[PDB]
Amino acid sequence: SASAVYVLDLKGKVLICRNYRGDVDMSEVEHFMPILMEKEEEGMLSPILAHGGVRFMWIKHNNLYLVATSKKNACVSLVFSFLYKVVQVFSEYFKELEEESIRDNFVIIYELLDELMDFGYPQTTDSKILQEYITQEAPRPPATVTNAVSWRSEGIKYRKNEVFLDVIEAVNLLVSANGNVLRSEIVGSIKMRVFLSGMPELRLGLNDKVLFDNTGRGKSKSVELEDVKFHQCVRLSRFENDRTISFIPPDGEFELMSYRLNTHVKPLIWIESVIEKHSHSRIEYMVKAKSQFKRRSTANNVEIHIPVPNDADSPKFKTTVGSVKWVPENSEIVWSVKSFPGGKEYLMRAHFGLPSVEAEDKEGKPPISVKFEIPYFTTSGIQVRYLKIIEKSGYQALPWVRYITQNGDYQLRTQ
Amino acid sequence: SKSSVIGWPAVRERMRRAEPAEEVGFPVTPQVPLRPMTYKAAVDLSHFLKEKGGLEGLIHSQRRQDILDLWIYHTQGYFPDWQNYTPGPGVRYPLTFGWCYKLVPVVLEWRFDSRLAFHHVARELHPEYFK
Amino acid sequence: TSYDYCRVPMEDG
Amino acid sequence: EMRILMVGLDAAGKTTILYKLKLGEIVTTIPTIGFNVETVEYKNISFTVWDVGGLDKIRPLWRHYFQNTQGLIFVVDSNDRERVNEAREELMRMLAEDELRDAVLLVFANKQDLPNAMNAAEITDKLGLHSLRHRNWYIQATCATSGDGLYEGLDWLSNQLRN
Amino acid sequence: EIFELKAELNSDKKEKKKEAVKKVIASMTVGKDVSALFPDVVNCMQTDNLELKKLVYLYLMNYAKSQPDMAIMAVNTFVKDCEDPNPLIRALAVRTMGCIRVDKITEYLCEPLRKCLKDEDPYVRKTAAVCVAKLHDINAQLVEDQGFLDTLKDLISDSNPMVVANAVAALSEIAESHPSSNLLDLNPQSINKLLTALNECTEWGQIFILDCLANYMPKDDREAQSICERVTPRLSHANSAVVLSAVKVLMKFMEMLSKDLDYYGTLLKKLAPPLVTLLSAEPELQYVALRNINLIVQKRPEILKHEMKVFFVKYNDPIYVKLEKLDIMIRLASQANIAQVLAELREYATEVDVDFVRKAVRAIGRCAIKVEQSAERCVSTLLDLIQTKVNYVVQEAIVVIKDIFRKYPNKYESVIATLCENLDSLDEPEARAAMIWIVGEYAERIDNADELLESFLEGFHDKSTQVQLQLLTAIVKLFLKKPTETQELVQQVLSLATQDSDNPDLRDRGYIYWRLLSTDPVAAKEVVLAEKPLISEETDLIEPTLLDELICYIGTLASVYHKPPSAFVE
Ligand SMILES: Nc1nc2c(ncn2[C@@H]2O[C@H](COP(=O)(O)OP(=O)(O)OP(=O)(O)O)[C@@H](O)[C@H]2O)c(=O)[nH]1
């Protein structure tokens, strides 16, 4: 239950404002930015500020503070999911979202905030359907905005019939400095790119553990999906009965399912870092990167960020394979390796100076955080098995898939 | 079934040296298409097991199954869950539509049965799972 | 997307 | 180029050395609280010499000068038997640091003017130079108010710039 | 300027009045009082364009509170554009009609709204359903005088379920406002109708027709099982407001189920992975998901006892999530994972976020109070923090050592011998009182407590209330323990605490101790050196008269604050 969706910017001037209820005054937004500066300059920052009896829910995009006030017992999960869906609608019209798009597209952004929300209750936010009666270039609203299938305008025609999948893994890791592994979870995201003709009914079938157990095949390779979060398009009752994933797809790119499973197997890339930090003199980094994964797959463009001290100087970098740039904007040495085969072990030795007069404040210890990307290689072992195109028209479509492992927050705590 | 000939003694030797009683993650062969071990592929595999020999009357285990399934997946492009059998009680019949061998105890051994391709005996042992 | 895809089966009933 | 310090105790004649090597006369000199710097150009090597005084309020601040230092000159006094104990204490408090570890040492037995003053051997075996490790230590008895031995010490130190 | 704008706005060609109204709502964008140009843009309203009517309706929507008597020159145009065959312009007119909050206008606007609530094309009905709540917000009895609640509750009896979602959203918005006269709930057959309209509406409608079910409570077991078995597959939705609202109605409806059957355990094994997977969402939604996990693990701790690992903070979480994951790590710490929590709190007190560091050391304290098996490990951890000599870490860890030694007073005498050598330059008066207390209470295993309190006796007259009063307690306790080496110390602290001390509580305690010590110092060992009874801890489990209602508000502002919904709204 939002009251007034604003768009602020980094100074406190309103790029665009649009109140829905009138239960919050319009000059309450001028009280936002001093309250945020006050709550941030004492460390009590929160997404829910408080100016008397008006609460400021807000998210912070690139330049934008999409503040949306309320007054009552506001449904905060609804307000924040609506703010990130406003961010996604703007970024699907305007390919970046900065101040240079809000002051140029007030023809269409007031129409969007007219359309998305009424009285505080979000009602039509699927952008691929919203591109059909709110344009920057009006007819009747489509029957998609009415009907139960509210994400797919009927009558889409392509010459070819291609369904592109992307079973993109994302290994999380958080290795404590003693050497043991704390949280090693994997967040996959099957991210489709659909190009079909009509109103199809796909039936995606994974190698889900509960499906292989209800069938009777509980001794082969089966991924154990701990929690699965689907898109809207997946009918969830049929998924809850017998683990069948049936969905009428949208047209374009979206995130079909976002699974998450834990893993008690070794990390993929392991970073044994030491630090010879003499006080007032220098520091050394005999960091080695052993690739625990299979010998066949090649970790494209790993970037082992390694946090140096803030004021280090005059570096030296004896590596084995791969360039080292010292990035002092971030105070880290981004040790890049382009082709990093599985089973190898590449060693690096940085060497800095250090200022002789000591610092004034302490700095903290950020983690070594790699940026790896191993294609054709699923860590959890999920295998897509089929994708049944069902269409009343009747045709042979061409499904496709590829496999990527990435990093999630692949961090490793330091000395 | 051309590429399965050169590993037909070698994978069999690694199976027989394996007792019937680092590395992380699962790579996928680039750009080579995938499909389950279908019906006529299973009949061609049964004739390949029948003419070339070396599988009948041999001691069956699960480790042999796993090494053979990973070998088939890495050398032919077929999903490594086609070699599934029923559990303990009864005869360890194959679940797969097209596997014409049944596993009686001697630890198991193969036994040929040319009606497992159509008359699904594992469906007779497991009626509710197959709808 | 620089990488390449792999065709998955249709029916598999 | 060769960055040089001249650390040591007070009344060691170190500013006298620093204005005898650069200029060449014994200029009347206050007990220097801060530091001096004079680029001595001898044996065609520009010896940047950071003369640092050694009163008791300064001796903690020598760690600000121990960086990129290619060699010390730890000037001891030959006429202070009571202070060679704390000269040894300073020299063993200072050479065991990680900054300034590849720094050669050139000890001067300055102020040779009395039979109270010792030679190189007794200052060596009171300071304990034979207990150093990874050191190119080299005592050289110099006379600051006559120039006797200073340029010979810098001649040794110019031999030990390159390897 | 604005006069030439009005001259372009009183033209006959469309391409000057169109640029005029676009320039007007660009002037409104940058923050100009263009309120004086109100009744001249409304002449440029009745247009064949639709890309222009949105802008004029927008201008009417912003500037009707400030031009209220002028605003009566749009009502005929609203009832004129609520007949047009295009459904978009009708629904635009309907969602404009409600937003104008002028009490001369809403009396006239019930007739086309009555026309549009029964209109055909369900875009305009799903607009008009929420416009009913817009009308009830302004003038309450005018709606029921027109009788729209019966027309609203009949929209629930229709198909095309986005209409049902907006009708239920506006109906809950109405039913919240009434004093619960003619309460708007229905039979379980209407609940079957909503639950079969739940698998078909949008990703936003599934929130509103699961905020309807937060008001209903069933009356059986098989009834509650039949509605939980159809709300339960909303726990696999990506939209992190649908999941949290399904957790709201499941945590409400599991107060009615039976613990003996197999659906309670099956339900709590389906409710833990969505609550864990809400924390793989965007960092403004982790704040609401963590305050609701904080409000669930106080009610049903049977769910998340196995998951400590997903509540370990990262480095790059914001501060408002790093503050709350420490609170959840306190709520879940038991004998199984004392080691992970202590090894994780020892790695958090090496930060520079001082709010977070103080919170981590107080979390060591609350984790030590919660489990009695590991307070030896906690005091060893706190001493390994104190031996690092960082000032605010020590000024919190001394307070935590106080709050452990009051709770576990038995066998921690081999710790204060490290604490007697702690460089008493310690500054903050929350920690000076803790150190004076630890010296006073345990002044037998501190064999030189008599010499270290004298450094606290140089500036007795100006420290604080707490440090002076703790010195007065501790020195009297030390003299009562050992009357040999502190005989003149108690006399000097009485002549400093009763003569030149103006603090009245200090004078009261000083004269009570002086009269006690001059009256009967042998009785004082039974008086002040007593066995103090066992300390009732500060139970931060919120009151289950309040907590039973705060389950009904999960994912709202009533659960983020952990307040009732009445002590913060106005
Ligand atoms: N006889 C004799 N006296 C010397 C010699 N060198 C220095 N002195 C005496 O030592 C005193 C201190 O010398 P300075 O160099 O001026 O002062 P300093 O030794 O640098 O003291 P700091 O600057 O604090 O290190 C001077 O007054 C000189 O009289 C020397 O070579 N022979």
Ligand SMILES: [Mg+2]
């Ligand atoms: Mg001098």
